[PDB]
Paper text:
Here, we report that c-di-[name] can assemble into a tetramer that mediates the effective dimerization of a transcription factor, [name], which controls the progression of multicellular differentiation in sporulating actinomycete bacteria. [name] is an 18 kDa [name] consisting of two distinct domains connected by a flexible linker. [name] sits at the top of the regulatory cascade controlling development, serving to repress expression of sporulation genes during vegetative growth (den Hengst et al., 2010). Specifically, structural and biochemical analyses show that the second messenger c-di-[name] activates [name] DNA binding by driving a unique form of dimerization that is mediated by a tetrameric form of c-di-[name].
To elucidate the molecular basis for c-di-[name] recognition and binding by the [name] CTD and to gain insight into how this interaction may elicit developmental signaling, we determined structures of the S. venezuelae [name] CTD (residues 80–166) and S. coelicolor [name] CTD (residues 80–167) in complex with c-di-[name]. Three S. venezuelae [name] C-domain-(c-di-[name]) structures and one S. coelicolor [name] C-domain-(c-di-[name]) structure were determined to resolutions of 1.95 Å, 2.33 Å, 1.75 Å, and 2.25 Å, respectively (see Extended Experimental Procedures and Tables S1 and S2). The [name] CTD structures are composed of two (β-α-α) repeats followed by a short C-terminal helix and are similar to the apo form studied by NMR (Kim et al., 2014). The [name] CTD uses a previously unseen mode of c-di-[name] binding in which two noninteracting CTDs are glued together by a c-di-[name] tetramer composed of two interlocked c-di-[name] dimers. The guanine bases wedged between the two motif 2 regions are specified by contacts from residues Arg125 and Asp128. Residue Asp128 makes two hydrogen bonds to the N1 and the exocyclic N2 atoms of the guanine bases on each end (top and bottom layers) of the intercalated dimer, while Arg125 flanks the guanines in the center (middle layers) of the dimer and makes hydrogen bonds to the guanine O6 and N7 atoms. In addition to contacts from Arg114, Asp116 of motif 1 hydrogen bonds to the guanine N1 and N2 atoms in a manner analogous to the contacts from Asp128 of motif 2. While the arginine and aspartic acid residues in [name] motifs 1 and 2 dictate the c-di-[name]-binding arrangement and read the guanine bases, contacts to the c-di-[name] phosphate groups are provided by Lys84 from β1 and Arg130 from α3. Rather, the c-di-[name] molecules are closely spaced and optimally positioned for interbase pairing, leading to the formation of a multistranded, base-stacked structure with top, middle, and bottom layers. There are 12 hydrogen bonds between the two intercalated dimers within the c-di-[name] tetramer, including contacts between the N3 atoms and exocyclic NH2 amides of an adjacent base.
Author numbering:
A (entry chain A): 84 to 155
B (entry chain R): 83 to 155
Write the structure that this text describes.
């Protein structure tokens, strides 16, 4: 389950989190989902984010877990 | 049309017509743990799955769902 902590994500500097921040905003606007605390995404979004980040999905997961943004 | 289904409108649909969609609905709800209201929205791509389960065209399925009042114009 890919579950993002939105309050934490917002405080990661753009230089690390910029593309994930923008990706999450596009999901929120498509959904009209502005709950303010959590955003769960499709497993297939991980694949997409990995392409954007130029990292493997597993390395990306580790990075987001290490930022405390993604639950482990 | 966005597939926003009214599970209560659907319940008033005769079982021969409604069955497959009620079964599918129950499967999505279980996969999600989503049991908190009478509206179920599903993916646009899910219309293909339902088309296959009913062996009806997607367009035909959408039109009838709308007639049963289950789906929004
Ligand atoms: N609980 C749950 N509900 C689901 C799931 N999949 C679809 N739905 C519901 O069905 C809707 C339509 O799904 P869609 O055609 O894929 O249309 C979706 C999709 O194209 C996109 N979208 C929303 N969220 C995500 C996401 O996490 N990842 C991706 N790749 N696209 C998303 O924006 C659309 C509108 O999203 P919504 O307004 O939320 O509306 C969603 C939502 O009510 C699911 O795995 N779990
Ligand atoms: N706004 C929002 N909240 C989130 C998200 N991720 C997790 N949650 C929270 O965590 C629970 C489970 O989320 P879930 O796995 O999406 O699983 C959800 C989801 O599958 C579904 N669900 C609830 N509300 C909606 C809705 O408005 N539209 C759709 N399409 N599905 C919903 O019901 C399941 C259980 O919902 P709850 O336990 O009552 O409540 C939620 C919700 O409090 C997110 O991306 N957006
Ligand atoms: N074909 C189909 N499959 C469905 C539908 N609903 C749920 N599933 C399946 O059940 C898994 C869990 O749904 P979830 O707990 O709501 O957990 C969902 C949920 O919280 C959220 N999500 C994904 N897509 C959407 C979306 O379009 N709208 C919203 N509001 N939430 C979404 O992301 C989580 C993970 O998504 P997935 O990895 O795809 O994992 C999804 C997906 O495989 C559906 O309407 N159609
Ligand atoms: N992954 C996930 N996403 C969530 C959750 N709660 C809300 N959302 C997202 O936040 C959007 C707005 O939810 P809402 O207006 O509060 O209120 C919702 C809700 O009251 C209702 N609704 C429509 N479809 C569904 C559905 O399949 N299940 C549920 N439980 N409610 C739905 O219609 C409004 C819009 O539904 P959506 O188009 O789905 O759009 C939802 C959905 O994208 C959640 O627990 N998990």
């Amino acid at each position: 389950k890919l579950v993002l902590d939105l309050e934490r994500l917002a405080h990661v500097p753009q230089e690390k989190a910029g593309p994930l921040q923008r990706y999450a905003a596009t999901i929120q606007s498509q959904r009209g989902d502005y709950n303010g605390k959590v955003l769960s995404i499709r497993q297939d979004d991980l694949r997409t984010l990995a392409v954007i980040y130029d990292q493997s999905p597993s390395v990306l997961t580790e990075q987001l877990i290490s930022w405390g943004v993604l639950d482990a």
